[PDB]
Amino acid sequence: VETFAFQAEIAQLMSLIINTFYSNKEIFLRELISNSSDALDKIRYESLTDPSKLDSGKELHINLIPNKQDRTLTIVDTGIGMTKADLINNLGTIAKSGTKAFMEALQAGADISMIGQFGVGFYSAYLVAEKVTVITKHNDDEQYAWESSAGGSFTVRTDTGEPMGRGTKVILHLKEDQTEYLEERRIKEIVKKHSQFIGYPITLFVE
Numbered sequence: 001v002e003t004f005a006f007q008a009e010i011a012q013l014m015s016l017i018i019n020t021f022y023s024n025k026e027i028f029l030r031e032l033i034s035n036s037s038d039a040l041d042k043i044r045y046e047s048l049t050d051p052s053k054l055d056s057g058k059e060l061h062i063n064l065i066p067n068k069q070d071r072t073l074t075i076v077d078t079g080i081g082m083t084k085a086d087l088i089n090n091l092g093t094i095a096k097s098g099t100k101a102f103m104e105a106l107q108a109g110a111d112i113s114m115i116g117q118f119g120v121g122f123y124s125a126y127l128v129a130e131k132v133t134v135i136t137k138h139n140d141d142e143q144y145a146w147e148s149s150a151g152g153s154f155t156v157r158t159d160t161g162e163p164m165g166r167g168t169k170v171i172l173h174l175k176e177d178q179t180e181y182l183e184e185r186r187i188k189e190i191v192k193k194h195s196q197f198i199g200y201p202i203t204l205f206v207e
């Protein structure tokens, strides 16, 4: 288990998301589904030249899994996945650029719902989650588990758990007052409203 400090801008963006009074918290799902969709597009392009990149899983889909018992909402994709370098260095660097542009926009009065245009949409997860665990598997690396409860740090460990094949699993440990995002009707309403035109099948799992 390795612990890393987020870069100053990301930590600032994260605490902005957690501290700003903003009622329209549902936008998080759209951001995670759109990230999954883009990840699925990346493995689909890579498969045009090198077809062996789909030996880790041919099916390209998105699964939404609520668990009332564990109070979690999981967003699963069979997209490209992420390497140790992606989790530790690359994610932080690609975000850094978009993070500053977004915080500048909100001052000037933009609103949180515009987070995705700045490529930092993933962090909107902290509108509803007290902790986020990300399980990922890329073709050129091992299975990793990234984790953060914000507070300026994140952890990275090798995942000894159930193999994934290829893709990303975003486990949202929901805040006590955000259990509505475990409800079938609510998820369906959000997916129909924000993600009705995703070019991959989205399966809402039930309990």
Ligand SMILES: CN1CCN(S(=O)(=O)c2cc(F)c(F)cc2-c2ccc3nc(N)nc(C(=O)N4Cc5ccccc5C4)c3c2)CC1
Residues within 6 Å of the ligand: 034, 035, 036, 038, 039, 042, 077, 079, 080, 081, 082, 085, 086, 087, 090, 091, 094, 122, 134, 146, 168
């Ligand atoms: C949104 N697209 C997806 C495709 N790419 S990519 O080119 O494949 C890439 C290049 C990188 F250099 C890199 F570091 C990561 C990724 C990467 C790959 C697959 C992904 N799958 C999901 N589902 N999500 C994210 C994500 O955006 N996350 C998860 C995650 C985990 C922890 C912190 C931030 C975040 C934000 C992913 C990112 C670009 C971004």
